[PDB]
Scaffold this active site. Structure first.
Site, mmCIF file in Angstrom:
data_model
loop_
_atom_site.group_PDB
_atom_site.id
_atom_site.type_symbol
_atom_site.label_atom_id
_atom_site.label_comp_id
_atom_site.label_asym_id
_atom_site.label_seq_id
_atom_site.Cartn_x
_atom_site.Cartn_y
_atom_site.Cartn_z
ATOM 1 N N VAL A 292 0.596 -1.505 0.071
ATOM 2 C CA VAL A 292 -0.088 0.096 0.045
ATOM 3 C C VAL A 292 0.967 1.386 0.266
ATOM 4 C CG1 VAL A 292 -1.879 1.294 1.469
ATOM 5 C CG2 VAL A 292 -2.381 -0.597 0.984
ATOM 6 N N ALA A 293 1.960 0.986 0.830
ATOM 7 C CA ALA A 293 2.751 2.401 1.049
ATOM 8 C C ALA A 293 3.527 2.847 -0.360
ATOM 9 C CB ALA A 293 4.167 2.108 1.955
ATOM 10 N N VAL A 295 2.959 1.889 -3.583
ATOM 11 C CA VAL A 295 2.128 1.520 -4.967
ATOM 12 C C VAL A 295 2.127 3.186 -4.657
ATOM 13 C CG1 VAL A 295 -0.193 0.097 -6.163
ATOM 14 C CG2 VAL A 295 2.095 -0.501 -5.513
ATOM 15 N N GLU A 297 -1.091 4.611 -5.803
ATOM 16 C CA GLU A 297 -2.679 3.569 -5.559
ATOM 17 C C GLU A 297 -3.735 4.872 -6.316
ATOM 18 O OE1 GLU A 297 -1.384 3.987 -2.403
ATOM 19 O OE2 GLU A 297 -1.097 1.889 -2.481
ATOM 20 N N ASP A 339 -2.617 10.662 -47.712
ATOM 21 C CA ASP A 339 -3.479 10.569 -48.171
ATOM 22 C C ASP A 339 -3.415 11.899 -49.148
ATOM 23 O OD1 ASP A 339 -5.637 9.832 -50.304
ATOM 24 O OD2 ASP A 339 -7.036 10.628 -49.447
ATOM 25 N N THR A 341 -6.304 13.032 -52.107
ATOM 26 C CA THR A 341 -7.514 13.738 -52.102
ATOM 27 C C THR A 341 -7.720 13.795 -51.295
ATOM 28 O OG1 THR A 341 -6.617 13.011 -54.906
ATOM 29 C CG2 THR A 341 -9.518 13.424 -53.942
ATOM 30 N N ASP A 680 -9.378 10.712 -45.693
ATOM 31 C CA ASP A 680 -10.979 10.810 -45.571
ATOM 32 C C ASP A 680 -11.365 9.351 -46.142
ATOM 33 O OD1 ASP A 680 -9.733 11.259 -48.690
ATOM 34 O OD2 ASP A 680 -11.718 12.170 -48.544
ATOM 35 N N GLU A 774 -2.950 9.942 -0.972
ATOM 36 C CA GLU A 774 -2.613 9.465 -2.051
ATOM 37 C C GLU A 774 -3.591 9.573 -3.301
ATOM 38 O OE1 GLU A 774 0.498 6.756 -4.407
ATOM 39 O OE2 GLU A 774 1.499 8.177 -2.857
#
Ligand code: PCW
Ligand code: PCW
Ligand code: PCW
Ligand code: PCW
Ligand code: CE1
Ligand code: CLR
Ligand code: NAG
Ligand code: NAG
Ligand code: NAG
Ligand code: NAG
Ligand code: NAG
Ligand code: NAG
Ligand code: K
Ligand code: K
Ligand code: K
Ligand code: K
Ligand code: K
Ligand code: K
Ligand code: MG
EC number: 7.2.2.19
Lengths: 987, 262
Positions: A292-293, A295, A297, A339, A341, A680, A774
């Site tokens: 938990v610390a 990572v 979150e 492209d 045209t 297009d 966090e």
């Protein structure tokens, strides 16, 4: 090999191949067996993965899985320690839930990035006829189109769409629209003649879903369903491996760094935990806390909020994104395949040049008439303008006078429509001018005459003569003239003029333009009286020895903002390649006009002509430009296509099939390019899907192109690509500032647990408080780095090397984690001990104190002074520890976000306050802080205590230290570019 | 070369440890400065100690609280209770109390200079016999054998905390839930009226009064019915002592389950 060859078979062979009849069709029964053998004549829709199951893998992936495991432990802990009646650890329920909410809320952030999720084949089925007229057992009748089968004898008339790929056996004045194959809506003739090797260019194949513009034809169904040319284009669109965007690659990179490091830190201390005597179940909980610390979150969420604020900016310039990943990719793009045209060009045939007075003049072809005009003081010009104006049968529809002349809708062919708008733009009002010179005779354009003619009363009341005016193919117009208008006089057409004509005519032809000659002749009243009876079938009028007036040529011109947009991209290090279905000569002319081919660049065929030396001997290296057509491309090896891409930096690919576009795109991709495609047409959707970002024109675009694309330009303003390149380069630079800011605080979230475990001091920082940092107090400031302006002149930088220049690399991380993150951690512990000692607990007594501290059977623990303390009182002081560690980190995050404003520039140069959103974010940080601390009730709800003013001050020397330390680092690297200090301590 | 050369692998390491030493050094100095702002005699702040905790011997814990249960017939069910009671009263022997002195003042004992030995302040004696019948003499079973047990109620000490001088702080024990069929909890306290004399206050901290001993009061429960579960609450009645905190059931009060089997 399902390639059509039936254009090269005789009728005898075709009847034998399909067991059919070229006049009577298939038997009723055999068409029903064939129906069951091949299936419906319809495009098979591949269903993409279900909407719900796409949401699922948004709940997997590196960080999501650690969170899952963590909530798993919290649930188990909340289980084991309620299976023995301990009610205090309902934190481990709330902890699990909050984590589960974070997993799920994050999973939504990755799913609501995809705004459209519309099927591509929905637009392809929409180009397909519902009905057909078939002949079976010599009875012609109308059938559902999906009942057609190879061998069926089909009738087509103008106005209906062609019901399959068809080998034409009979045709009367038949023309088709093959734009979905070539990108070009110029009508193509269909005969039963085999006019080419390729079935894509022979006249006697017509293609499923193409519009029959006029005429009638009969033919043999030669392919159906997904085997039709349009089915294969659709297959290539939908069935493209859905590769990760450049930013998705980058995000999963740093997720795999973090999820690994989290697992290292968690597992090595789980071992340490058990090694130092903790129970297994308690180590299992440390592993959850460490994850938990460590990572972050809320990180993924901040990233998609940052993308969102770029998407919003793009959208305000009429540039619309379909998924927030696409909001980055132009920044990382190194090759654009465009492209021509309707992408680079207006898809509108326009007057481009004029030959008169023995000189070639250039007309302004821009849609807003923002260009350079031609000289109109000539009297030869006034005459040629009268001819091209009166000898026109097109007309503007009523009441469009608020419409720009280019946009207006004309009843006529492309040619006449072009001449009419040109007229309206040089004169006041073409139709009104025309009415002032009444038409008294006319021959419309005809295949026999090979020209068009009309004779006209003159506006001037005084002059009674009639004026003959005529247009047509130039050589054929010239062979009926005997004089020519040159510089105010009329001159007999000697060999020098006829040669001057031929040069101008072939020159305009060499610019890929379509040419018409224009002549006139004033008929004297003496032979033609004011009421003379001009009979067309009589041909009372002469039709020879007229006065030649001039040439007019026309072209599909660039859009006005496109030539500068193309220079901008190249200036940004982006290669630009034309990839067009159109014919090469026109393609090369537009490539040159638009700056894809620079002034001076030569093809090998160019050099060969200058030196008057054959092409075999021209040094290939010496040609900066190259034009390859579809046929040549089909002939090449891939070793040869890459050799051409490397040799000639200015590359034009003309007359390419849709698959050929995709093949060129992926050829650049295999070489390491991040490729954008601008297009297009239906014919561009396969290349559009395969590009790392596909951009479609919003107005000119066809649905298949828009639905295959990842970005839409709502106003058709190609220059928006330049914006996209810039914003993409900004977001990437700013994302790494935001990410660096978010990561660095993960370390002083972690180290309190490492000391808690291995030193057994009372817990400095709880899980609930970590989440608040966090997910709440630090989220706005990291997002406000989105608004950081560019440190350097980004639009002159090369595009980034996607292998070496990553979002998060070891310098960014190590610096953030193990230098600044460590300073923050030291601050935290300094406040912790200050708050403890000022409350009775000296540092030496905290070491090993955790067991008595956390003991509910111990209501009289003695502090350093000998004062006796209850668990309750101790618990609150533990919270006061949480809170004092929380503000140590918040204070340092002020310094942190300020040093993340600039990676190389000093804060004194660009200033601390230019970014205004950041300061609002800094202020909001402190408020929600004070709220958490000093709102009454907070100690019993979120474990926040109203700390003393002194413990806000304690960590400020560390923050100031963070600013000063980075400020000097950034100074060191400006002052020493090549040094060790840069090579190692620049991130 | 494991990500860079082995010469560069070293100059990186040196920087990081140097950084880490300087930072460690800086931190060590902060703790040292801290330990000079700190007074060895009086805590800087007592935010969490506004009101004193209370505790009771013998302290036996069941689930979610103090739970005490024994059988008058089987003397071995209360052996440990009397034993920890006796073992607790050891630091209140006359010999263990040689470091502190007689206090007769029955008022707050204010000492501003350090006249006791080794530069300390005096502390007042409290000897086990002050609890009389509940002192272990002449009843070494502390009233358990006769089913009228003594519980000792101790107040958590806090530096310079004054409980109120209009009278001595007293203990009062009553039933948490007064049984409708029942009478009130009948209790006799030693010393008389369950008081802590005023002299024992203020506490000056372990360095100033190393021989300090918390005064005690014993609560002899006379009423409690046999083979029934009851709950007793003992509250400190003093001007500056509170017992209302719902997040600390040991603030100014102590509660315990009791069951005297027969
Ligand atoms: C990746 C590698 C990272 C390396 C990190 C290294 C961290 C360790 C750094 C230093 C070690 C501790 C330094 C202690 C300095 C003490 C200085 C000092 O002389 O003070 C005196 C005190 C004793 O007081 P007294 O008895 O005289 O008081 C009586 C009161 N009067 C004086 C008024 C009478 O001495 C004492 O406390 C001695 C006891 C010290 C307390 C132990 C604390 C343990 C906590 C460690 C957490 C560190 C977190 C680091 C975060 C790194 C992030 C990567
Ligand atoms: C791949 C992974 C590599 C792993 C690295 C391993 C290397 C380090 C491993 C061991 C180092 C020495 C271990 C010492 C030998 C065992 C000590 C021991 O058996 O003690 C267990 C104690 C519990 O006994 P107690 O007397 O407190 O019980 C009190 C009972 N009650 C609560 C009822 C009152 O455990 C507790 O709960 C609190 C601890 C109190 C005892 C002091 C021990 C702390 C000393 C060193 C720890 C530092 C290791 C950090 C390594 C960091 C690597 C990055
Ligand atoms: C990503 C980057 C992050 C890097 C962070 C990684 C952290 C890993 C570091 C691990 C180092 C662990 C050091 C373990 C020290 C154990 C000290 C110890 O177990 O020593 C015993 C005495 C404590 O007193 P006691 O046992 O009588 O109290 C017990 C009272 N009873 C018996 C009544 C219960 O320690 C003493 O005297 C003085 C000893 C002073 C200890 C200061 C430790 C500070 C060191 C490092 C921080
Ligand atoms: C590159 C240049 C940037 C770094 C230079 C800045 C650091 C020095 C400059 C200013 C320091 C003070 C800044 C203002 C904030 C005060 C923080 C503080 O007051 O912190 C002192 C704490 C212990 O607080 P206390 O018991 O004196 O509170 C007394 C409370 N009253 C008096 C109300 C009862 O101990 C400590 O942080 C240790 C203090 C010892 C000095 C070393 C500073 C280490 C910084 C790194
Ligand atoms: C280059 C940049 C690097 C430097 C970074 C510097 C960052 C600067 C940030 C500034 C932050 C300012 O913070 C203000 C903090 O205010 C704290 C208020 O302190 C009050 C002290 O009172 C102590 C509380 O004691 C608890 C009991 O309170 C009794 C009185 O209560 C009255 C009613 O209040 C109820 C809540 O206390
Ligand atoms: C301070 C003491 C106790 C710890 C020293 C341990 C050493 C071996 C650790 C601490 C910091 C670590 C470095 C942190 C930063 C970087 C830069 C990165 O691009 C490669 C890894 C590298 C180079 C690490 C290598 C190992 C390292 C040098
Ligand atoms: C009045 C009083 O308290 N007397 C006794 C006495 O036996 C002894 O002399 C004194 C310490 O001097 O301890 C106590
Ligand atoms: C509440 C109560 O009963 N208090 C008594 C008081 O009446 C008596 O005067 C005193 C004698 O020292 O003992 C105590
Ligand atoms: C300090 O004085 C006390 C008085 O009780 C004495 O017992 C102790 O031995 C002395 N210690 C030292 C180190 O002087
Ligand atoms: C205390 O002891 C004395 C002496 O035996 C006795 O008279 C008195 O009743 C005892 N009190 C209790 C509650 O047993
Ligand atoms: C109680 O204490 C105060 C100290 O403020 C003192 O002045 C007063 O005389 C005392 N009164 C009694 C009745 O003890
Ligand atoms: C107490 O002990 C006696 C014998 O030692 C036993 O008969 C009795 O049942 C016990 N009391 C209870 C409540 O079990
Ligand atoms: K975290
Ligand atoms: K038209
Ligand atoms: K007239
Ligand atoms: K189109
Ligand atoms: K794409
Ligand atoms: K793709
Ligand atoms: Mg097109």
């Amino acid at each position: 090999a399902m390639e059509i060859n039936d254009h090269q078979l005789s009728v005898a062979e075709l009847e034998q191949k399909y067991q059919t009849s070229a006049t009577k069709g298939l038997s009723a029964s055999l068409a029903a067996e064939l129906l069951l053998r091949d299936g419906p004549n319809a495009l098979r829709p591949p269903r993409g993965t279900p909407e719900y199951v796409k949401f699922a893998r948004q709940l997997a992936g590196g960080l999501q899985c650690l969170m899952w495991v963590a909530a798993a432990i919290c649930l188990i802990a909340f289980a084991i320690q309620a299976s023995e009646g301990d009610l205090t650890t309902d934190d481990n329920l709330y902890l699990a839930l909050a984590l589960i909410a974070v997993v799920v809320v994050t999973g939504c952030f990755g799913y609501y990035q995809e705004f459209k999720s519309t099927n591509i084949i929905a637009s392809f089925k929409n180009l397909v006829p519902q009905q057909a007229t078939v002949i079976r057992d010599g009875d012609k009748f109308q059938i559902n189109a999906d009942q057609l089968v190879v061998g069926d004898l089909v009738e087509m008339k103008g106005g209906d769409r062609v019901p399959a790929d068809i080998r034409i056996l009979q045709a009367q004045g038949c023309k088709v629209d093959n734009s979905s194959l070539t990108g070009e809506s110029e009508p193509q003739t269909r005969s039963p003649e085999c006019t080419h090797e390729s079935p894509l260019e022979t006249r006697n194949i017509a293609f499923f879903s193409t519009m029959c513009l006029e005429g009638t034809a009969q033919g043999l169904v030669v392919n159906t369903g997904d085997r039709t040319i349009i089915g294969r284009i659709a297959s290539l669109a939908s069935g493209v491996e859905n590769e990760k965007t450049p930013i998705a690659i980058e995000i999963e990179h740093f997720v795999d760094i973090i999820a690994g490091l989290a697992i290292l830190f968690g597992a090595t201390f789980f071992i340490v935990a058990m090694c130092i005597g903790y129970t297994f179940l308690r180590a299992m909980v440390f592993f959850m806390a460490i994850v938990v610390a460590y990572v972050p979150e809320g990180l993924l969420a901040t990233v998609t909020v940052c993308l969102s604020l770029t998407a919003k900016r793009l959208a305000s310039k009429n540039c619309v994104v379909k998924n927030l990943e696409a909001v980055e990719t132009l920044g990382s793009t190194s090759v654009i395949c465009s492209d021509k045209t309707g992408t680079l060009t207006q898809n509108r045939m326009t007057v481009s040049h004029l030959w008169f007075d023995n000189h070639i003049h250039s007309a302004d072809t821009t849609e807003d008439q923002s260009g350079q005009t031609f000289d109109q003081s000539s009297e030869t010009w006034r005459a040629l303008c009268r001819v091209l104006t009166l000898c026109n049968r097109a007309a503007f529809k009523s009441g469009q006078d608020a419409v720009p002349v280019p946009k207006r809708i004309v009843i006529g062919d492309a040619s006449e429509t072009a001449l009419l708008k040109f007229s309206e733009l040089t004169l006041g009002n073409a139709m009104g001018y025309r009415e002032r010179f009444p038409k008294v005779c006319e021959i419309p354009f005809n295949s026999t005459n090979k020209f068009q003619l009309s004779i006209h009363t003159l506006e001037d009341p005084r002059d009674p003569r009639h004026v003959l005016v005529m247009k047509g193919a130039p050589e054929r117009v010239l062979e009926r003239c005997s004089s020519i208008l040159i510089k105010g006089q009329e001159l007999p057409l000697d060999e020098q003029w006829r040669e001057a004509f031929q040069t101008a005519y072939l020159s305009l032809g060499g610019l890929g333009e379509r040419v018409l000659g224009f002549c006139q002749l004033y008929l004297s009243e003496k032979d033609y009286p004011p009421g003379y009876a001009f009979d067309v079938e009589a041909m009372n009028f002469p039709t020879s020895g007229l006065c030649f007036a001039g040439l007019v040529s026309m072209i599909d011109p660039p859009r006005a903002t496109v030539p500068d947009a193309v220079l901008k991209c190249r200036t940004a290090g982006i290669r630009v390649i034309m990839v067009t279905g159109d014919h090469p000569i026109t393609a090369k002319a537009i490539a040159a006009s638009v700056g894809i081919i620079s002034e001076g660049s030569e093809t090998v065929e160019d050099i060969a002509a200058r030196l008057r030396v054959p092409v075999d001997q021209v040094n290939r290296k010496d040609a900066r430009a190259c034009v390859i057509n579809g046929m040549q491309l089909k002939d090449m090896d891939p070793s040869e296509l890459v050799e051409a891409l490397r040799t000639h930096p200015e590359m034009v690919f003309a007359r390419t099939s849709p698959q050929q576009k995709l093949v060129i795109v992926e050829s650049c991709q295999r070489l390491g390019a991040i490729v954008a495609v601008t297009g297009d047409g239906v014919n561009d959707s396969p290349a559009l899907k395969k590009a790392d970002i596909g951009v479609a024109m919003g107005i000119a675009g066809s649905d298949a192109a828009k639905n295959a694309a990842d970005m839409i330009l709502l106003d058709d303003n190609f220059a928006s690509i330049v914006t996209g390149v810039e914003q993409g380069r900004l977001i990437f630079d700013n994302l790494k500032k935001s990410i660096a800011y978010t990561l660095t605080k993960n370390i002083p979230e972690l180290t309190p647990w490492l000391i808690y475990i291995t030193v057994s001091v009372p817990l400095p920082l709880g899980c609930i408080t970590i989440l608040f940092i966090e997910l709440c107090t630090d989220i706005f400031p990291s997002v406000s780095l989105a608004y950081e302006k560019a440190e350097s002149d980004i639009m002159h930088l090369r595009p980034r090397n996607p292998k070496r220049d990553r979002l998060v690399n070891e310098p960014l991380a190590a610096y953030s984690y193990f230098q600044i993150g460590a300073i923050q951690s030291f601050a935290g512990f300094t406040d912790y001990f200050t708050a403890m000692a000022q409350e009775g607990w000296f540092p030496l007594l905290c070491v090993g104190l955790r067991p008595q501290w956390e003991n509910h059977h111990l209501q009289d623990l003695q502090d350093s002074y000998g004062q006796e303390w209850t668990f309750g009182q101790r618990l609150y002081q533990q919270y006061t520890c949480y809170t004092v560690f929380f503000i140590s980190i918040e204070m340092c995050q002020i310094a942190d976000v300020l040093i993340r404003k600039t990676r190389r520039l000093s804060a004194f140069q660009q200033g601390f306050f230019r970014n205004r959103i950041l300061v609002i974010a800094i202020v909001f940080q402190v408020c929600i802080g004070c709220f958490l601390c000093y709102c009454p009730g907070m100690p019993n709800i979120f474990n926040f205590m109203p700390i003393r003013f002194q413990w806000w001050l304690v960590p400020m020397p560390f923050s100031l230290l963070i600013f000063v330390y980075d400020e000097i680092r950034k100074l060191g690297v400006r002052c020493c570019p090549g040094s060790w200090w840069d090579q190692e301590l620049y991130y | 070369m494991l990500g860079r050369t082995l010469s560069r692998w070293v100059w990186i390491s040196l920087y990081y440890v140097a950084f880490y030493v300087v930072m460690s050094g800086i931190f060590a100095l902060c703790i040292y400065v801290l330990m000079r702002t700190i007074d060895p005699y009086t805590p800087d702040y007592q935010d969490q100690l506004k009101s004193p905790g209370v505790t009771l011997r013998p302290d036996v814990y069941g689930e979610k609280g103090l739970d005490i249960s024994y059988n008058v017939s089987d003397s071995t069910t209360w052996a440990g209770l009397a034993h920890t009671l006796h073992r607790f009263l050891a630091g209140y022997s006359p010999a263990a109390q040689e470091g502190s002195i007689n206090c007769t003042s029955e008022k707050y004992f204010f000492q501003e200079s350090f006249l006791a030995p080794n530069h300390t302040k005096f502390s007042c004696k409290f000897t086990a016999d002050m609890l009389q019948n509940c002192s272990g003499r002449p009843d070494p079973t502390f009233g358990f054998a006769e089913g009228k047990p003594c519980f000792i109620i101790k107040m958590n000490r806090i530096v310079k905390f004054l409980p109120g001088n209009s009278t001595a702080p007293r203990v009062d024990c009553a039933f948490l839930d007064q049984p409708r069929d029942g009478p009130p909890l009948q209790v006799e306290y030693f010393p008389a009226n369950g008081t802590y004399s005023l002299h024992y206050f203020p506490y000056y901290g372990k360095k100033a009064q190393p021989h300090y001993s918390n005064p005690l009061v014993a609560a002899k429960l006379l009423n409690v019915p046999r083979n029934r579960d009851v709950v007793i609450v003992c509250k400190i009645l003093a001007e500056h002592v509170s017992f209302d905190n719902p997040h600390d059931p040991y603030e100014g009060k102590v509660e315990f389950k009791l069951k005297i089997q027969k």
